[PDB]
């Protein structure tokens, strides 16, 4: 448990953590915000209720 | 020898065209919404299509153009459903300007 022979291996450790400190923070907003590929619940829902099955008659 | 309806009926393009499916008809844009184009073509429904990006700029309201119609009225029934539903529009596909 010495920090001096082992500078390199903590060097990996600690420029990942970084790394993976952004992607988590850019993946939450972005996907919100980002349109791809399917829709949201909040914005699929939006849509059904526009044309909303009738299983009565009138 | 006032002409009746069933005259004009059986002797109308729609009537006499059959079905739609990959017929080549001509439209007439009468609306655009940014890219999309909303295209008129004889039917009771329009079709939007959406701009094409080799000319964009030539699909301006009241060019003429070519689609292959495949419905004239987009409907289906779901689970549960005692009628169709319609979207109230056709789906054709853009082939371009009609080159007079």
């Given at each position: 448990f010495r920090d001096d022979a082992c500078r390199k291996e903590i060097q990996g450790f600690l420029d990942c953590a970084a790394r993976a400190?952004?992607?988590?923070?850019?993946?939450?907003?972005?996907?919100?915000?980002?349109e791809?590929?399917?829709?949201?619940?909040?914005?699929?829902?939006?849509?059904?209720?526009?044309?909303?099955?009738?299983?009565?008659?009138? | 020898?006032?002409?009746?309806?069933?005259?004009?009926?059986?002797?109308?393009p729609l009537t006499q065209m059959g079905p739609a499916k990959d017929k080549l008809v001509i439209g007439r844009i009468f609306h655009i919404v940014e890219n999309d184009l909303y295209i008129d073509f004889?039917?009771?429904?329009?079709?939007?299509?959406?701009?094409?990006?080799?000319?964009?700029?030539?699909?301006?309201?009241g060019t003429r153009v070519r689609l292959r119609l495949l419905d004239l009225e987009l409907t289906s029934r779901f689970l549960g459903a005692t009628t169709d539903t319609t979207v109230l529009e056709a789906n054709a596909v853009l082939l371009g300007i009609q080159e007079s």
């Open positions: 400190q952004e992607a988590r923070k850019m993946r939450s907003i972005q996907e919100t915000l980002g791809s590929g399917s829709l949201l619940p909040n914005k699929l829902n939006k849509l059904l209720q526009r044309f909303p099955n009738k299983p009565y008659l009138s | 020898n006032v002409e009746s309806f069933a005259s004009m009926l059986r002797h109308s004889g039917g009771k429904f329009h079709c939007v299509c959406r701009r094409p990006e080799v000319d964009g700029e030539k699909y301006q309201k």
